[PDB]
Amino acid sequence: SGFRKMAFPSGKVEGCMVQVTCGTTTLNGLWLDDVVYCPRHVICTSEDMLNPNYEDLLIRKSNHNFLVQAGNVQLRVIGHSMQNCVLKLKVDTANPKTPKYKFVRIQPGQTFSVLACYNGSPSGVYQCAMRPNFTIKGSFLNGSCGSVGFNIDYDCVSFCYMHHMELPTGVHAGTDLEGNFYGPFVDRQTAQAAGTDTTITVNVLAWLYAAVINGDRWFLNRFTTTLNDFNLVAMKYNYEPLTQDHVDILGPLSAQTGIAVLDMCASLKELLQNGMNGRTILGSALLEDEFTPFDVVRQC
Amino acid sequence: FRKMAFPSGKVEGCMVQVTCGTTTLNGLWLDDVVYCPRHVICTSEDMLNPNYEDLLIRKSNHNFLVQAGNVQLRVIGHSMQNCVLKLKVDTANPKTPKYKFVRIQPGQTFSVLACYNGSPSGVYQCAMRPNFTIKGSFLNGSCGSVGFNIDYDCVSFCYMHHMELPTGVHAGTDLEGNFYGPFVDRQTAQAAGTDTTITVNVLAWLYAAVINGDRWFLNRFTTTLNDFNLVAMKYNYEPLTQDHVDILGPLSAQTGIAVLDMCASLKELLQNGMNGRTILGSALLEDEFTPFDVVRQCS
Ligand SMILES: *[C@@H](O)[C@H](C[C@@H]1CCNC1=O)NC(=O)[C@H](CC(C)C)NC(=O)OC[C@@H]1C[C@@H]2CCC[C@@H](C2)C1
Numbered sequence: 004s005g006f007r008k009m010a011f012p013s014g015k016v017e018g019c020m021v022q023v024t025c026g027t028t029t030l031n032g033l034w035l036d037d038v039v040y041c042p043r044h045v046i047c048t049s050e051d052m053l054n055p056n057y058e059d060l061l062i063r064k065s066n067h068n069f070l071v072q073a074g075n076v077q078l079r080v081i082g083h084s085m086q087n088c089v090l091k092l093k094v095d096t097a098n099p100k101t102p103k104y105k106f107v108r109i110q111p112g113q114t115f116s117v118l119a120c121y122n123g124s125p126s127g128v129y130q131c132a133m134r135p136n137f138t139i140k141g142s143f144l145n146g147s148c149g150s151v152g153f154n155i156d157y158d159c160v161s162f163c164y165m166h167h168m169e170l171p172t173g174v175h176a177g178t179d180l181e182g183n184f185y186g187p188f189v190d191r192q193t194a195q196a197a198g199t200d201t202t203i204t205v206n207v208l209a210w211l212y213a214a215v216i217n218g219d220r221w222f223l224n225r226f227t228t229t230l231n232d233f234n235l236v237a238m239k240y241n242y243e244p245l246t247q248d249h250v251d252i253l254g255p256l257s258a259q260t261g262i263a264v265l266d267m268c269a270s271l272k273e274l275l276q277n278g279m280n281g282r283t284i285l286g287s288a289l290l291e292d293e294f295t296p297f298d299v300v301r302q303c
Numbered sequence: 304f305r306k307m308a309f310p311s312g313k314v315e316g317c318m319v320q321v322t323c324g325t326t327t328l329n330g331l332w333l334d335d336v337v338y339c340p341r342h343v344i345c346t347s348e349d350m351l352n353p354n355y356e357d358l359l360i361r362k363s364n365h366n367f368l369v370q371a372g373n374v375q376l377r378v379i380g381h382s383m384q385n386c387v388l389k390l391k392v393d394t395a396n397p398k399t400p401k402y403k404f405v406r407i408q409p410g411q412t413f414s415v416l417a418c419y420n421g422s423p424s425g426v427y428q429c430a431m432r433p434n435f436t437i438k439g440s441f442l443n444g445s446c447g448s449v450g451f452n453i454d455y456d457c458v459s460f461c462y463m464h465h466m467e468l469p470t471g472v473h474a475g476t477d478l479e480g481n482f483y484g485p486f487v488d489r490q491t492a493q494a495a496g497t498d499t500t501i502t503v504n505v506l507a508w509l510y511a512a513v514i515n516g517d518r519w520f521l522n523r524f525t526t527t528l529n530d531f532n533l534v535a536m537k538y539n540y541e542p543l544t545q546d547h548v549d550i551l552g553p554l555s556a557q558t559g560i561a562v563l564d565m566c567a568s569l570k571e572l573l574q575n576g577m578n579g580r581t582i583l584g585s586a587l588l589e590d591e592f593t594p595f596d597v598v599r600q601c602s
């Protein structure tokens with residue numbers, strides 16, 4: 004039947020991407036109705052990036068300092084304001100391609116699609132998880148800021164992420180569409196470390212169920228565990244504890260496969276203690292934790 | 304390195320549904336033609352052993368229901384080309400992108416827009432395996448979903464989905480209806496040949512490791528292409544073609560490591576193993592990133 008890391012179709016979001024330039028900085032913006040959202044650090048020069056007093060820098064800007072381009076057309080900025088780390092540019096034109104949309108803040112362990120853009124042009128789409136330490140393992144290069152992450156329920160696009168920066172370890176950080184960072188990060192040009200990351204246990208279990216659904220069971224065993232004994236071992240290996248809500252969420256996969264959640268926990272416990280002995284699961288040598296139970300259900 | 308798909312919007316704007324009787328699948332609407340798998344004309348029982356020419360002679364334009372969403376597109380002509388149906392419709396698709404039809408080589412990657420009832424569900428990156436199957440994610444009603452690459456503004460369609468095999472992998476055609484590999488669109492048991500590792504992509508991956516400063520595996524030797532190919536096949540790796548050497552050209556230039564020197568380095572990895580080390584944080588050599596994929600993500 005198959006299993007691959009699958010993103011939402013990106014077309015509704017592609018119709019909203021524009022280019023925003025201020026000075027010699029260019030990045031992407033999100034054009035909804037008559038407003039363009041983008042990272043506020045577009046207004047910084049080098050002499051500012053190290054400790055930017057954004058309110059003081061922004062009040063010195065005029066509408067005409069912002070060049071917004073949608074393809075071949077320049078949009079006229081008729082006003083601007085700031086919400087946390089996101090700049091909101093009012094334009095004199097409504098985007099006819101505006102989808103039904105909402106702004107959401109996602110929880111660590113939840114997943115979303117990223118539309119990576121450069122110079123206002125979409126380049127790639129891929130699936131990410133909000134890490135427990137509020138980083139994301141993205142593929143973002145110079146010029147990618149303002150790229151957004153999203154989910155689609157029915158015809159509605161829920162925007163949950165806007166891209167701002169890369170950390171020294173190569174992972175990425177950003178904000179929701181209200182401009183609040185995920186995690187303890189700051190939009191200044193400094194080397195920032197994240198909290199210790201952990202593995203998203205409920206997502207690992209969903210992926211093991213996916214592997215069973217696709218006909219692989221080598222990692223199963225005849226044992227079981229209590230929830231607390233599992234969580235003790237999980238935490239020792241820097242895995243997130245599994246809550247009873249997580250257990251409930253795994254119900255449909257448990258029902259579909261006939262493998263009790265706590266039996267799958269006993270399987271994962273053996274994998275954590277014994278490793279994979281060179282084997283692979285669904286093509287992977289590592290336990291994958293960026294598929295949620297909902298993701299697996301939908302795709303299988 | 305992520306599996307990264309192309310943005311799907313230009314292809315979403317071309318997806319429709321095609322129904323015959325109660326059999327429904329997806330079609331691709333470009334200008335005033337809709338392309339879809341020919342088995343839309345089969346009942347489920349026909350699919351066990353179809354005579355497509357006989358089935359088609361019994362069909363008329365007015366037996367085909369083509370819908371963009373819930374909006375009917377009237378069919379004004381039909382023809383069969385290999386395993387695809389071409390349905391001429393009375394409306395040119397205003398969202399038609401610049402496009403081309405290409406037949407890809409094994410090892411090449413592409414994005415798949417998985418569709419159901421003409422509605423996109425998700426997009427993901429696939430590699431065409433050397434045995435001409437893809438490790439896709441397809442459910443009932445997914446036939447007619449297409450695979451594609453995007454070059455500048457031009458969509459190059461390369462795959463249309465038709466079949467699942469007993470092993471769970473997937474088989475399909477190019478947009479001229481010619482199957483990849485030795486498969487037929489008949490609901491019968493068909494086996495794919497034993498799969499092999501995509502050497503050109505493993506080499507691309509080693510170049511990617513070098514670009515990122517991970518280069519312990521570079522050795523001082525080189526090899527001929529023929530000697531490498533003969534050794535590689537003993538480890539169930541694909542032989543390299545001249546086209547493979549050529550598409551590694553840019554990464555070879557970027558790193559200053561000749562293709563055949565990297566081949567010698569890979570040969571040593573095959574013959575001596577990893578010796579407990581890793582490459583790009585992995586003991587497994589990755590074979591589903593092409594040289595183009597490596598460039599898209601590094602530069
Ligand atoms: C978007 O403007 C940009 C995107 C970064 C660049 C590389 N990968 C990304 O995701 N954001 C920034 O550059 C950001 C601006 C500050 C928050 C004001 N800082 C940042 O990301 O610093 C790290 C990069 C890492 C990389 C290697 C060294 C030099 C550059 C590029 C700084």
Ligand SMILES: *[C@@H](O)[C@H](C[C@@H]1CCNC1=O)NC(=O)[C@H](CC(C)C)NC(=O)OC[C@H]1C[C@@H]2CCC[C@@H](C2)C1
Nearest residue numbers: 342350441442443446465466467488489490491492
């Ligand atoms: C689109 O019409 C479907 C999509 C399939 C179904 C589920 N996953 C998919 O990828 N295509 C088919 O149903 C084709 C139609 C015929 C080629 C005309 N048939 C098919 O995929 O059959 C699968 C088959 C494989 C084994 C061998 C014989 C019986 C079963 C086991 C089922």
